[PDB]
Design a protein around this ligand. Structure first.
Ligand SMILES: [Zn+2]
Ligand SMILES: [Zn+2]
Ligand SMILES: [Zn+2]
Ligand SMILES: [Zn+2]
Lengths: 89, 89
DNA sequence: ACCGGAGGACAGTCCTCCGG
DNA sequence: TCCGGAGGACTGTCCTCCGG
């Protein structure tokens, strides 16, 4: 089943043979089969672990700071910004 | 297709007839077909939105509580109590 | 009666690779 | 060449209701 890295990236049929394969072989490229990427399980128990801890950190957050701040953090991607937020106390 | 509240809790086969079904007519029972109860979507995109929020709060709380059992706190249910606690900031 | 879990239709993923 | 998105095997859900 697994297509080689390059065929994946390019989205063309892979011959998939061993070691290399038609277009990496032909075209002159180093053909690889990368490991599947580890992702979190998409189960319902796990979505619920995570929604319900996020909820409880939100509940605790609100005893400490205003709701308007909740909404800012819940969007920040930068670690300086998450820290500065906290520094304006 | 939908089974009745009761056949649902008792786990027996439901006749499904409306308004009152098999048993619920028999045992002269309060027969409800309660509406289809919502869950949040199990999709990858939504698992991931929620995991990004949780990470950001998780990070914000590493700085509020650099010292431990945040989990102790996360389990409490009382608002006064939690706030009595935190005022040991 | 009661309820753990089998059974199965279905929701939605997460791959490959076709074709504009 | 290139990538949107179709195709479709599959993972895991989430019902019902069997039979112990
Ligand atoms: Zn290939
Ligand atoms: Zn290759
Ligand atoms: Zn019924
Ligand atoms: Zn009924």
């Amino acid at each position: 089943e697994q297509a080689c890295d390059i065929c994946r990236l390019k989205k063309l049929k892979c011959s998939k043979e061993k070691p290399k394969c038609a277009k990496c072989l032909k075209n002159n490229w180093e053909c690889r089969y990368s490991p599947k990427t580890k992702r979190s399980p998409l189960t319902r128990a796990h979505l619920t672990e995570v929604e319900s801890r996020l909820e409880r950190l939100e509940q605790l957050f609100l005893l400490i700071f205003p709701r308007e701040d909740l909404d800012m953090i819940l969007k920040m991607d930068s670690l300086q910004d998450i820290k500065a937020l906290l520094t304006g106390l």
